[PDB]
């Protein structure tokens, strides 16, 4: 099985912290680049935080930026989300992602799935 489960979330005031986790199952996690994208209230998705546990390199939107910290423990095969001085505009589901890129014909397909199972980050 091939998953990549979430947990962490919740109900919180603004200021405050929360920590979120993807446990990656059923695949390696260092030829991907895993990470979260958060879904607004009647918005698509967009790209939360992405981190490549090969280089353990990061990005992370503007409206994120300096306040959330992505981390990867290969080891457990989980990403992290450290989110720190919540702002009412983080209010969205979460979901754990992963983009891909692989040619079938070069140049390619790029590729992004998250797992629908997210988790309802709401700050009061």
């Known amino acids: 099985e091939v998953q990549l489960v979430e947990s962490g979330g919740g109900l919180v005031q603004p200021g405050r912290s929360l920590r979120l986790s993807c446990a990656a199952s059923?695949?390696?996690?260092?030829?991907?680049?895993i990470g979260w994208v958060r879904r607004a209230p009647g918005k698509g998705e967009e790209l939360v935080a992405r981190?490549?546990?090969?280089?353990?390199?990061?990005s992370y939107a503007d409206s994120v930026k300096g306040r959330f910290t992505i981390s990867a423990d290969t080891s457990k095969n989980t990403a992290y989300l450290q989110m720190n001085s919540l702002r009412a505009e983080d209010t969205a589901v979460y979901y754990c992602?992963?983009?891909?890129?692989?040619?079938?014909?070069?140049?390619?397909?790029?590729?992004?799935?998250?797992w629908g199972q997210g988790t309802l980050v709401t700050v009061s």
């Open positions: 992602a992963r983009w891909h890129w692989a040619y079938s014909a070069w140049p390619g397909w790029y590729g992004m799935d998250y």
């Open positions: 059923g695949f390696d996690i260092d030829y991907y680049s």
């Open positions: 981190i490549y546990p090969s280089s353990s390199s990061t």
